[PDB]
């Protein structure tokens, strides 16, 4: 039964792993330099060039 508890807390460990990887993804999308800025870059540079 202590082994069972250890397995369950391993499950919650990896669940927290998924949680903070999702947090990493969302903060990366919330960063300043992003897809909208880079699309502005590409479009303006293409036309003016």
């Amino acid at each position: 039964k202590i082994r069972r508890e250890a397995a369950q807390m391993q499950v919650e460990y990896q669940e927290t792993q998924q949680a903070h990887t999702q947090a990493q993804l969302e903060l990366l999308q919330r960063k300043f330099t992003n897809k909208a800025l880079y699309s502005w870059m590409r479009g303006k540079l293409s036309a003016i060039y």
């Binding site: 999702q22 993804l25 969302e26 999308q29 992003n34 897809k35 909208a36």
Partner: protein, 49 residues
């Protein structure tokens, strides 16, 4: 006999597992904003060429 068990109280019908609904994933997207330009100041004409 009333609760339909064994002689030692073990249930005669196996309890259903009741498999949970389990969690779901989350999603995020991009958000944009628009602005205008500043007022054009009339350039004070110098004397140079």
């Amino acid at each position: 006999l009333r609760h339909n068990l064994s002689i030692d109280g073990q249930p005669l019908s196996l309890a259903i597992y009741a498999e949970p609904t389990d969690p779901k994933a989350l999603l995020t997207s991009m958000v944009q904003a628009s602005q205008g330009g500043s007022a054009v100041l009339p350039g004070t004409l110098s004397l140079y060429r």
